[PDB]
Amino acid sequence: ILSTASVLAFERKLDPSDALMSAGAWAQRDASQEWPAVTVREKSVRGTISNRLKTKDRDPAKLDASIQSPNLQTVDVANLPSDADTLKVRFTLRVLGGAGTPSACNDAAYRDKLLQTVATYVNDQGFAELARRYAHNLANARFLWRNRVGAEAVEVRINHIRQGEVARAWRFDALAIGLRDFKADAELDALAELIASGLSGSGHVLLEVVAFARIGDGQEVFPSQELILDKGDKKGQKSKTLYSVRDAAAIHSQKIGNALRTIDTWYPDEDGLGPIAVEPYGSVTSQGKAYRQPKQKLDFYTLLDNWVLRDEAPAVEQQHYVIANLIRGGVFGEA
Amino acid sequence: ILSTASVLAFERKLDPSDALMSAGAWAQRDASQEWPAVTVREKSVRGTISNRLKTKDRDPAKLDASIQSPNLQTVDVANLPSDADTLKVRFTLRVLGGAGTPSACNDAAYRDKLLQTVATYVNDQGFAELARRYAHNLANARFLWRNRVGAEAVEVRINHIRQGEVARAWRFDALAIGLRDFKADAELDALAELIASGLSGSGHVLLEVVAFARIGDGQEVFPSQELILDKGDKKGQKSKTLYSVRDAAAIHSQKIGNALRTIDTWYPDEDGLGPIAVEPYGSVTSQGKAYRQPKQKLDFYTLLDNWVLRDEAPAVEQQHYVIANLIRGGVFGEA
Amino acid sequence: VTDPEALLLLPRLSIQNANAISSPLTWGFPSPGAFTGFVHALQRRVGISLDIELDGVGIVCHRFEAQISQPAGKRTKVFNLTRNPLNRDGSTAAIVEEGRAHLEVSLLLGVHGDGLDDHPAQEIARQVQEQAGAMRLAGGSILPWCNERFPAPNAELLMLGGSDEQRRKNQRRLTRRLLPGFALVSREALLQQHLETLRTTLPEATTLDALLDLCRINFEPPWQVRDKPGWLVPIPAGYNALSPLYLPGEVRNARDRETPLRFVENLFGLGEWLSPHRVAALSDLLWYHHAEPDKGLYRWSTPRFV
Amino acid sequence: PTWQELRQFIESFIQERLQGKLDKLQPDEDDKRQTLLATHRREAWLADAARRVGQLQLVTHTLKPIHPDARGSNLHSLPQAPGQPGLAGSHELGDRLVSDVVGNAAALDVFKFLSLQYQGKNLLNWLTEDSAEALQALSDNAEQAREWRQAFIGITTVKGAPASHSLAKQLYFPLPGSGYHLLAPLFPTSLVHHVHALLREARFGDAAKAAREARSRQESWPHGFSEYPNLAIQKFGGTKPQNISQLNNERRGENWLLPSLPPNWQRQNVNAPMRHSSVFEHDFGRTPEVSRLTRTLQRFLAKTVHNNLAIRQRRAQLVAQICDEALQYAARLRELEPGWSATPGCQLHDAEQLWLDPLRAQTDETFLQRRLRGDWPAEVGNRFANWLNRAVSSDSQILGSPEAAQWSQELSKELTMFKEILEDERD
Amino acid sequence: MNAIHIGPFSITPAARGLHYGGLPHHQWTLYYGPREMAIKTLPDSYTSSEVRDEFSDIIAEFVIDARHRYAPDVLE
């Protein structure tokens, strides 16, 4: 009857690194390997009452009593120096390949059927649209999440590292390449072909991606931020903690991965928002609403159980979404 | 009547040390004694729900409420430094003598019959094929596991330490030697001769196995994840924990031993995977399925009672599997 | 049971995965019975061929690391486990919680016999070192120090000193060799006198409660802490009889049918970790077997300590 | 005394079990009440209990904590009290003994049928004697009473042959003259349950929590408390602790092992004091062991003299520990770089540097190798004694009395030993 | 759930619930009037006694600091 396997664990293709952010100046970004790293320093904030009240403290006496005695916090803040306007963010991506093969599989016949499904996909339409959209999401600096929203000029340099040497260099203007339109460019098509060769298993692709963004002298940059379980008083009301590896601010690798996975333009809702991150049940935490819900038959799990188990091949864009989920990797499979 | 011994236990021959993981640059592998160790750090992840739903929480309201609650974990991560593209993995292997000699045995007659069976095995063909496969699994860096998957170049240096000096240095290209083909090479045959002399000897043979993998600059290395049971505690814990010895990431010795024992290419199922680890009842944890079942006459216990008690000597491949189990060890014996 | 004619210093030995659960009541550093059994296995394997006897072991414990973790919200600890192989039906087997520890210990071995006059000291020292480099000490493999900077050979020092000052200088040099560690000794007299002190404090108090009081941190109201003479760990002090000594072939599924088997219960005593410069002689630190097989009581101790 | 009250109590017990299983089943049809009362309402249930007492076993030491696929002989035996002093065991458990139950998870009801208090005592000790009220309160016939008494008292005696499985531990012990004993150990579940109960009273008892609150309020209390740090949890049953034993179902896993740890079990790091003025007051003194030792000396310096010399003996032992740690500090200074003392610096405590780095004599052939041999630096401990003079209390009552004289005497003796230790570093 | 009132102390939870680890969690806040002293993330499976015992150490520390801060003067 070809039941799906209990474990269908997939490895993560397009493996990113922790994107370290340093600081420097524009027109000195060619020699940027000596640039000093952005430090995660500390500062204090005085938080006034600016949230919605619960229709019990709305009296003026208790509101003025709370406002008379406010609350102080210590925040980890990452800023550029006052003589550095350009933020540099550096990470290495590793395009592995073999996306159809899962790492763990309880059923051998289901693994064979999934391998045949991915093989028939690659024979029909290989990793050409997917690698084009991944090269798009690398070309615009979407991994600069809040470091791109007010940036004057963003430039992305991607170097193909072969035997410790740069095999091929790409230099993209990340503001010209939009965050919502997947157009065509010759250098972008070359990068798409390189990521296609990496994903097909025909070559080993490692890329060094360095993004330079003009934010401003001393402007606050936005690295990854850590969860804080306890604030307390021994720790001086630590409300925000940013991520750093060794006295050097950085973004998490999975944030770069989520920004790179933002290729899904084929969800059943309108594409006026643009692409969303590739995920089962197409979930966006900022929107708070699942595109591709399990009720409307267009999510990853029902499309995979139709494409593989019952040989119901979906549309070309939907099978692009399914193979993009397979590239993303996960703990797909029931209990 | 030659009853089986009710206790029958064997020492772990080829017992490796914990695979110490450090970082450096390629073509600096000669001066790798001062390479800084890979340190396991902590980081925070905010994912979204992407597991299978069991048709009771697939309504959009409950699913959107589950997305609206943020899913957070703390994970132990090991990364290379952003100026070191090579991961060095170093361990020490002791090939112990008396491979067919059990630690415990009830019957003196069964001990004499088992020693005579092993002695006829050494007089017929020796440990030559088994040590060839062990030298293969040392020669390709299967003990790197997920560090071996997307590496540009893996090179293994194996040094025989006789008294206090390198008696013989072997150098192997780990990517050229496949994970599934056991071919013939002169250096591999010399390493096989040394390991087989260590198995046939009375003392031990000491080897230093170092593997350099060109994973990529700043990439994510994969040490052994520690098996910690949550035990149903109320407080949420870190989902992923790693292994280290002293501020220095490491792989467990049993994982290196499992990679070294991945020589079994004689199981009755098809060898689409290739070699599996030498286990009683052929258990593979990555598949959830156990080959060499006792309902067939190819599990280790029935093969041992046929070879020893009833004098039904199996095929040479199954004799290799049985002696590979004896080198592997284990606790056997019916009640 | 005898004064050693010589002391052999096995150097820093890195035991990889030693049994961290020393006893049904204690965890941490392994049993001294493991060390005494290792020295008796060394005498069984290479001691007889060298015409020497190896009795008495002094443990220094230069480094200890426990493969443990502290879960959030609890002040206790749990043992990190190993993934056992699956069963024949592909399911996960039942987990037996076994803890592991990375040790680095150096051992003082009491050597007596005529073979000390028949061989050079470095020859028998190197022979027992290369025998011990392929053995186990508490369930863990011994790392035999490959490709580091400077390996450490033994130093067998004859305890029959020509002069008292030369013997004193030899013992102080041997103590200086095993410096970053703590000698683990047995404290039956201290535990017994603390039991008598508690019995004067409160009657019908067992030796278990006196052992427990010497390990917990007692808080006294005026809020200070009741002090202890030393580290005062709870050690497994041996094995007491739980059954009559059956015949060698009587017990079903025994390890061998030539050795008599007797079911036992763990004996718990008080041990102390001291800096090894606080001893009169390094032969006091030797852990000796003491069977007394008619009454059970299969103990290991440090006789001739104080 | 009378058999009638024992009969009333056992009939009340089986009626309580009948109404409990009737409330648990909640059956209103399908004749389940008749089938429930046809086997657990009369003496035949006792006969059914005769089918259940042979399966169960009352033990004090079991093998099933060792690997649960092992089938050995679990035995109930109290070990003899050892004549040698200063060691404990399960022999210390006298009347404070709880006997573990092994076997099926359904026959265990009859365990309370052997653990009631009808006449004021446990019924196993009532059935171990041929009492007048015994053998009549449970059976009208004599032979049925005899076989029921034998089957009910057989839960204590070990069943089967004496055996220990392969997965159980067996450990050779050398005899004094030419022999070995195999010595298979069993898990003392009664002793472990007693220790776990004592730790439960120590850590979660009402009096212990009240003393903890009194410590938190910094007020007085008639009794103290304990903390038991660094405990370890060892769960035997993975997901079914009831399959191990009944006492392991009472404490679900949770072996609660005591911390038998060496003092170097939490070695933090080794650090080189480069840009600092004195090692004892800046880097060595900030370690927690000598911190607790210095607070202990501060507490013991300003104290009464009623136990004086004995306290002074303890004080002498106390002060010995500190110089021990100094040697231990120098011991981990053997684990550092060979030539850290030759690095550039304005102030790096060069007076102590002859003893801080003994390996620089290998680095310099004659620049500093002969300096430590000719100088023989043993005055550095006197500098440490100055730091130890900051460990004493600033009380004029000690200086006026001979307490300062005894403190100076034991200080001079222990730094004499320290200087003699530092003298022969060249060998 | 609801606030825990220990004298002048109020342990009030955030209305939002997080999912630290896999289990749901809530950020519980301890106030002495308008001033907060400890914000701690605690599971939703915690009872009121466990939430009280989590902040009991900081409560006792503040009580000790108030005793040693407003102690009356001593005449000898």
TrEMBL record, chain C:
Which organism is this entry from?
Pseudomonas aeruginosa
Q: What is this protein called?
A: Uncharacterized protein
